[PDB]
Every structure is written in structure tokens, then in C-alpha cells.
Design a protein around this ligand. Structure first.
Ligand SMILES: CCCCCCCNCC(P(=O)(O)O)P(=O)(O)O
Ligand SMILES: CCCCCCCNCC(P(=O)(O)O)P(=O)(O)O
Ligand SMILES: [Mg+2]
Ligand SMILES: [Mg+2]
Ligand SMILES: [Mg+2]
Ligand SMILES: [Mg+2]
Ligand SMILES: [Mg+2]
Ligand SMILES: [Mg+2]
Ligand code: NA
Ligand code: NA
Ligand code: NA
Ligand code: NA
Lengths: 361, 361
């Protein structure tokens, strides 16, 4: 789409600005510049640009209905593209660090960044850190005299902390809460008692939904000077809901979508993750199924990993996913209807977000 | 000292505020709260509090010479203690991530955080990330209606990016710049051509000096509303200079101070780091010494590591350190003299910083 190439063109302005500032102010040599260019490209490009392109979609919505000089339209769009790139760079940061914490092997149809031969965990940890400072450098440079700067930085902060807290819920999702202890090596749960819908929901709310839906949506609002034109409690509710669905889909695909289709390789079963599959399976399994699940979950072993998949397929989780999906369609449509009271344009941007999410892979 | 306990008392307000906000807003359970409390304590406490206590020292300086109501004094101090803790928490972040990137084993006389049995690299990477979000949570909560908020956040940003860039110079300091390549596994340098004073200076400027001296000093200025009362080009120069010295000392101690005295275990020789020892040794060695150095540097091997130490001792680097030190005394005193034109009080805070630095371990 033309609009996605126009987005990428702003990626090139930003890359150019960051790398020139490295040379002019940070005493960098061409070879490290080159390494940081390739790192930026590898970690930030080749996704679908969903987060970034949402910020742009929202802004366009308000421009269709709003009186502006042409130079104001151009600036709003550019600000939305820049804000889009903050969020894509924030994602890049999270995926680089996440792939380390998950012992992942592939991302966007390539090796995880830290697995590149000339990278390694040593460098990629820091590269992940650079990725997020860049989001701040962008904000302070591009949005220096913007009315929304302070509101934006503060929202960005808050989304980032929630996501890190959520990551903590995720990485410890396989241990018994009463057993967490810096001093003692953590055992994997044997009862699976904390694999419940409530616990799963909390994990997903934090680790995924703030940065993937709340941020892009409210960002689109901020660059638009349009936050007073929506019910922010509704933005939060619908972002948290669509974001949960997004993760459930992510959980399903980890187990059931071919790696050549997915672009990554699934590790949830081996990582013992609290995925939607695991929770739902335990929500409907009989006594014997639970025992066989417990014997196999959370082991690298191919005969074990494979057994968990047959336990999943045979428990007819498409039924459960279909009823889950149907309830979310209900509730998202409703939240949409509700946002139309104040903001027909925003509600429509939300319909598009929902539709693009609902039919992905 | 009473003043250090008063500092710690603000650490307890902040810990309490962060952890209560975790319970009240982030749906945290007591056991993860407990893990995050212990993590905070382990990574943030038990140092000398040099960075934090500088912010307080500077503020006190201006309070001695400035008319304020008593309630204004109390607030300025509290703001300086809070700003101090931002910097200590930012250090905590850097040391947790640094110890991962350096395969370190001890820190402040204990195991590195990631080596705690119930931690591991998986969790500590994220814990290091949490540490820095906390610095932003503090700033936005404590300094919400402060005139200096925006200037502070922007300085904080800029210091953090420089330090990450510097970390990149550090971690790649042992590879030939023309050989950096994400695609190819990096070889350690055989010529050691980039072990020069200019290259070493650049590494140290960025990785150490911004966060350890520039930030605390200017922070003290910010909380004091006193930035217009100093020559900021002089603050930068003297922070960069004392900070370089600080690192040189850090480089010396890694090789020559007993681990029971130091609180850490040295890995520079084994990591092949571009330390001040390595650079100076190559600055004065003869042909034969260079060859024997090259045969042994950058290997875990105890007979190799040990040989580099004898090459260091026998090359009389105390001579070189003493001439280095003497030149820095000259230049720091001068910068001090120069800061007295505008700010006798600040220059005196700088004398104290210098004196405390100059006589450490
Ligand atoms: C500090 C790191 C924060 C990470 C944010 C959550 C990243 N989640 C996405 C992944 P998840 O399933 O690992 O949660 P993936 O795309 O690997 O399936
Ligand atoms: C993202 C990590 C940034 C790290 C900032 C520099 C940390 N340096 C201090 C250490 P260094 O000698 O490793 O530079 P140590 O105290 O281990 O001697
Ligand atoms: Mg993952
Ligand atoms: Mg993960
Ligand atoms: Mg996943
Ligand atoms: Mg280190
Ligand atoms: Mg280091
Ligand atoms: Mg050191
Ligand atoms: Na211990
Ligand atoms: Na258990
Ligand atoms: Na490759
Ligand atoms: Na070489």
C-alpha cells in the first residue's frame, strides 16, 4: 500500500537523523554506525507495522472530519508517522529482549537478533536497550515544541512499565507464586493451580495490551489533539479486550501454525508457558487427561511436546476458541457502539483495528 | 553519617510508594511484590551512594547561601534525595545488565544479581529493565508540578543514551572496527591497534562519565533552580575529567585490588577489555613485551592471566598512573578555579566530589 511506503519513508528520515547525530555528537566511527544501522533495520523492519500504522489510521480519521490548513495536515501525518515509529522501536526493544528471555530461535522469518553470529547475547542486550533510548530521542527531537509532548512521554512511560511488569508475570507464570525466591532455584509448578482464566488475563493485559493497542490508539489521539473527543475509559476497555484476543491468537498460533507460515518457531509448550491453550485444556479436561498433561508439559523432549499437541487437538479447543471469539465479537462491537456516542470517527478507526486483528494469519 | 541515613529514609518512602502502586494499580500478588522488594534492595543498596549523595551535597551548598522558607528547604532536600535515588536506580539498572554482558560473578561483596539461584539471566534482564522504568515513575510522581521536570527528563534521557552508546564502545573494544559484522562471529584483535589513549578516552567518556558525574552534578543544579548560576561548559568539562579518572582507578583496581577489598572480582584481562592498564602498557612496552602481551591477553587461563599481571607490574605502571593523576589534579583544580568566577558554592561542591573520588579504596 502507498500508505505503508510513506510510513517507511519516515523510518528513513529517523534512521538518517539518529545515525548522523551518532557521527556528529557521539564520536561514532563508520563501522559502528554500520552495525547500528543493520541492527535498527533487522529489529525494526519486516513486520506488518500494525502498531505504527494504527497511529497513522487514527490520525487520518480525524483529518477527514477536521478543518486544517494543508501544512497542518502534513505535520499531523508526519507526527503520526514519527509516533508510529516510537512504538515500532519500543516493540523492537521488547522482541529483542523477549527472544533472549524465551530462548527463541526465529523472528520475522530470520534468526532472533541475539543469535546472529556477530551479535550474541552480550551485544543484543545492549542493542535492545539502545532501541528504547532511541524512542526517547525521537520524541524529544520531533515533538520538542508540541502541546502534547508531556502527555505523550508520560503515557509512553506508563505503557512501558506495565509491559515490563507483565513480562515478569509471564516469565514466572510456570512457578508457584509461594515458591518465588531470589535465594532458591525455582521449580516448575506440579499442580498447575495458577493456570486459570483470571491469572492468564492478568498476564496478557500487562505484557501485551498496553503497548500493542492502548498506546497506538491514544498516540493517534495525542498527535491529533483529540483526546478530549473520546471516552478514555472506553478506549482502555476496548484496547485491553482486542489486545487480549490478539494474544490468545498468538497463543494458538505458537502451537498450531506452521513455522514457515508464522515467521517464528513456537516454544510455549517447552517453556511451560501459561498459554490460552494450557488454561482452556485444564478448564475442560477429565482426571486422566490432567495427569497425562502434567507428565508432559514443559519439556524440550519431542515425544513429550508432541503428546501435549495431541491432548490439545483431541480436546477440541476450536470449539472453545470459537465461543471465546464469538463473545469478543459481541463485546468489541458493543464498545464500538459506545464510542460512537462521542466519536463516530474514532469508533470507525477502532472497527478497522478490530477487523485487521480479527482476520490476521 | 546522619545525612546518608536521611537519604536511605527517602529510599524507604520510594520503595513503599512503588510497591503499594504495584498492589493498588498493577494487580500484583504479595509474593511477586516480595521478589521485587528484594530485587530492589539487592541491586540498589549496599554501595557507597556516591551518585545520589552528590545530588544532595550540591543542593545543600546552594541552601547555605540562599534565602528560603524552611518548608522550601525541606522540599529542596527531599527533591535532591529523590533525584539521588533516580540516579542510584539508573546505576542499578546498568550494573545488573553490565554484569550479564561481562560474565561477572560478584558485585558489592555478593553474587551478581543474575547469578542468584532464584533469578537467572532470564529474570534479571527484565529486572534490570524494571529498575530504569522505576526512575521514570519516580520522576513523574515526585516532580509532577516542578518547573525543572522537563529539563530533568530530557537530561536524564540524554545521559542514558550516551551511557548505552558507551557500553557499545566498551563491549566491542576488543574487536577490530573493520571486522564488526552482525553476520560474522567477531574475532578478538591480534594487532591491538585500537588500544590507544584517544580510543580509551572515548570509551570512558560515554560509558561512565555522563551518568556518574555529569548527571548527579547537574541534577543538584536542577533541583536547586541554579543552572543559570554556573558555566555549563565547565560543569561538562570537569564531570568528564573526574569521571575519566574514576574509571582509570576502576581499571587499576580490577587488576590490582584484592576481591575482598574491592567487593567485586576482576574480569578485564580475561574479557580483553580496553583498560587503562592495557593501553598504557602498550604505550611504553618494547618489541618483545608487546609480543608476550599479545600471546596472553584475553584468555580465562590462569597462567596466561597471571603473565599479563607480571608484564603490568614489571612495566612500572605506578609511575604512569602517578603522572596521570598529577596532570588530572592540575586540570581539575583549574576547572575548579574557573567555576569560582560564577559559583563559589558549586566549585566547592566540586572540590568535595573531587576529594572523595581522589582518595577512594
Ligand atoms: C522486556 C520485554 C517485554 C516483552 C513484551 C511481550 C513480548 N511478547 C511477544 C512474544 P510472547 O508470546 O513471548 O509473549 P512472541 O511474539 O515471542 O510470541
Ligand atoms: C546498559 C549497561 C551500561 C553499563 C554502564 C557502564 C558500567 N560500568 C561499570 C563496570 P565496567 O568496568 O564493566 O565498565 P564495573 O563496575 O563492572 O567495573
Ligand atoms: Mg516470546
Ligand atoms: Mg515471551
Ligand atoms: Mg507467543
Ligand atoms: Mg563490568
Ligand atoms: Mg563492563
Ligand atoms: Mg571495571
Ligand atoms: Na546470596
Ligand atoms: Na505445584
Ligand atoms: Na542471517
Ligand atoms: Na587484528
Amino acid at each position: 500500500m502507498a500508505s505503508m511506503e510513506r510510513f517507511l519513508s519516515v523510518y528513513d528520515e529517523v534512521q538518517a537523523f539518529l545515525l548522523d547525530q551518532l557521527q556528529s555528537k557521539y564520536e561514532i566511527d563508520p563501522n559502528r554506525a554500520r552495525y547500528l544501522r543493520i541492527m535498527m533495520d533487522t529489529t525494526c523492519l519486516g513486520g506488518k507495522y500494525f502498531r505504527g500504522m494504527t497511529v497513522v489510521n487514527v490520525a487520518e480519521g480525524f483529518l477527514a472530519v477536521t478543518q486544517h490548513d494543508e501544512a497542518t495536515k502534513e505535520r499531523i501525518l508526519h507526527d503520526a508517522c514519527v509516533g508510529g515509529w516510537m512504538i515500532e522501536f519500543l516493540q523492537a526493544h521488547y522482541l529483542v529482549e523477549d527472544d533472549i528471555m524465551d530462548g527463541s530461535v526465529m523472528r520475522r522469518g530470520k534468526p532472533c537478533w541475539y543469535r546472529f553470529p556477530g551479535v550474541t547475547t552480550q551485544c543484543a542486550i545492549n542493542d535492545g536497550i539502545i532501541l528504547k533510548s532511541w524512542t526517547q530521542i525521537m520524541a524529544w527531537h520531533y515533538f520538542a515544541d508540541r502541546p502534547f509532548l508531556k502527555d505523550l512521554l508520560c503515557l509512553f512511560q506508563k505503557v512501558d512499565y506495565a509491559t515490563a511488569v507483565g513480562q515478569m508475570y509471564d516469565v514466572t507464570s510456570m512457578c508457584d507464586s509461594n515458591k518465588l525466591d531470589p535465594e532458591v532455584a525455582q521449580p516448575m509448578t506440579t499442580d498447575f493451580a495458577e493456570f486459570t482464566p483470571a491469572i492468564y488475563k492478568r498476564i496478557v493485559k500487562y505484557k501485551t495490551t498496553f503497548y500493542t493497542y492502548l498506546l497506538p490508539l491514544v498516540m493517534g489521539l495525542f498527535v491529533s489533539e483529540a483526546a478530549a473527543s473520546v471516552e478514555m475509559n472506553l478506549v482502555e476497555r476496548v484496547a485491553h479486550l482486542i489486545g487480549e484476543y490478539f494474544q490468545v491468537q498468538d497463543d494458538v498460533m505458537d502451537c498450531f501454525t506452521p513455522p514457515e507460515q508464522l515467521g517464528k518457531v513456537g516454544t510455549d509448550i517447552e517453556d511451560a508457558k501459561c498459554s490460552w491453550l494450557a488454561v482452556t485444556f485444564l478448564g475442560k479436561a477429565n482426571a486422566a487427561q490432567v495427569a497425562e498433561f502434567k507428565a508432559n508439559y514443559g519439556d524440550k523432549d519431542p515425544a513429550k511436546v508432541a503428546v501435549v499437541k495431541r491432548l490439545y487437538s483431541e480436546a477440541n479447543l476450536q470449539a472453545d476458541f470459537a465461543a471465546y471469539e464469538a463473545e469478543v465479537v459481541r463485546e468489541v462491537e458493543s464498545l464500538i457502539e459506545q464510542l460512537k456516542v462521542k466519536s463516530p470517527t474514532f469508533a470507525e478507526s477502532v472497527a478497522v483495528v478490530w477487523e485487521k486483528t480479527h482476520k490476521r494469519k
